[PDB]
Every structure is written in C-alpha cells, then in structure tokens.
C-alpha cells in the first residue's frame, strides 16, 4: 500500500500472507473460517505454497505465526484470465487455522448487500509502499 | 516490501464513475476504491478490502489490479465480493 500506515499488530486478524517455498511473500488473503482462505485467482496459488497466519512483521523470528499447508485450490471458474474478471480463489487448508487473539475470520456479505459509493473502507497488506 | 503490515482508509467509488478512469475494463464483478491519495500496490493482490457493517468488518473487495505505477489519483480495482459470494457458499457447501 502506498501512503498507508502501519497497523496495530494483530488488529486485522483475518489477514494472511501467501508464501512460496523459497519464503517469498507474493499475495495476501483473508481467513473466512478456520479452514478456508479467500484470495485472488490471479495469484496463481498451487498446493506447494503456504498460508501464513498471525503475522505482522515479516522480519521476525519470534512471532507465533501459523504456517498452514494448502490442501486444495479452488479457482472460481468464471475466472477470466484475459480480463481478470471474477478474480477469486478459495484455498482449502490441510490443517485448520487455530483461532486466537491474532487469528480470526472476516465476515462475508449477502449477495444482496449494499455498499454505497462514498463509504470509507479499509484495505491492508504487505505490498509495495512506493513504486 | 515493507516488513510490517500496512493499512489504509479509502472510499468506495461507483462503477460508473470508475469507468471514467478505466473504461470497459470495469466489469460487473469488479468494484473500485481509492483515488484518494492512497493506493493498493503490487504485492497487495489477494488481500482484503473491508467495510464495517452493523459493527462487523465485512469482506467487500479482494485486491485485484489497478495502475502500473500505483498512482494515488487513480482508483484501485478489487474483485466485488457480493457478486461472487454465491460461488463461495456453493464451494464451501460442496467441500
């Protein structure tokens, strides 16, 4: 995020990080329950990647993060790679996230929800802070 | 790139107004936000765009794509979750 700010640690307990076997953090995701993560289809997750939960500082050796394996990848299948439209994938974890103060779920909306233009929302992540 | 988790507040835009920036690239299953002096960026993809509803944070967008340079004057494009929630429940249900 460009021009964002550091978050209070553990305040966004559903945010996870997607990391490849070399340990590189490539995408974010959100826990929707103990067993599933929602992320983007275009992240191209494979079951050789790992879901990191409870983490705040990626520098850290002393944080009590959870490193979760992925059992199955579910790419939406109206996902349109030409347009990046319907860009959502479900990740079914091999082992359940252990819910705690720093690890919990975000709620999902009703298909019927209204989120008006003008509404102030929040986006979080470990992406670039400057281009 | 940053080590510590970042966050930012930004407003929701209408698809129609979103289309002024992005034209025909803006599809139904997309929602724009930002253009407010902040921007989601490379590396943020897949992460949440949450809104408070009746006191609980709700998953409204999934970081998708936007400007190549993360311009803070252009809206970011997120996957619209309301449009995709039926799919999520069916998958959960069947799996």
């Amino acid at each position: 995020i460009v021009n964002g700010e550091e978050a209070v640690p553990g305040s966004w307990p559903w945010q996870v990080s997607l990391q490849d076997k070399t340990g590189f953090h490539f995408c974010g995701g959100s826990l929707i329950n103990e067993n599933w993560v929602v992320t983007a289809a275009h992240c191209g997750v494979t079951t050789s990647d790992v879901v990191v939960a409870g983490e705040f500082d990626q520098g850290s050796s002393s944080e009590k993060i959870q490193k979760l394996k992925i059992a199955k990848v579910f790419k939406n299948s109206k996902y349109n790679s030409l347009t990046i439209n319907n860009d959502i994938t479900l990740l079914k974890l091999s082992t359940a996230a252990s819910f705690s103060q720093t690890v919990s779920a975000v709620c999902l909306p009703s298909a019927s929800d209204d989120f008006a233009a003008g509404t102030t929302c929040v986006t979080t992540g470990w992406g670039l802070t400057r281009y | 790139t940053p080590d510590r988790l970042q966050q930012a507040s930004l407003p929701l835009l209408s698809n129609t107004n979103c289309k002024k920036y992005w034209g025909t690239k803006i599809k139904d299953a997309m929602i724009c936000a930002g253009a407010s002096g902040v921007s989601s960026c490379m590396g943020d993809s897949g992460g949440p765009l949450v809104c408070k509803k009746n006191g609980a944070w709700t998953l409204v967008g999934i970081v998708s794509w936007g400007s190549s340079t993360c311009s803070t004057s252009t809206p970011g494009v997120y996957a619209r979750v309301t449009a995709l929630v039926n799919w999520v429940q069916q998958t959960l249900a069947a799996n």
């Binding site: 978050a7 209070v8 640690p9 553990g10 305040s11 966004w12 307990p13 559903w14 929707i32 705690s100 103060q101 720093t102 919990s104 779920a105 975000v106 709620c107 999902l108 929040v122 | 966050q7 507040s9 949450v50 509803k53 006191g55 609980a56 944070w57 709700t58």
Partner: peptide, 10 residues
C-alpha cells in the same frame, strides 16, 4: 467474524 480481539486504530 469481523470483530477483532485487538482493535484497529485508524
């Protein structure tokens, strides 16, 4: 869901 144990600060 959506109610963090530790409160976000904006």
């Amino acid at each position: 869901c959506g109610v963090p144990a530790i409160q976000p600060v904006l």
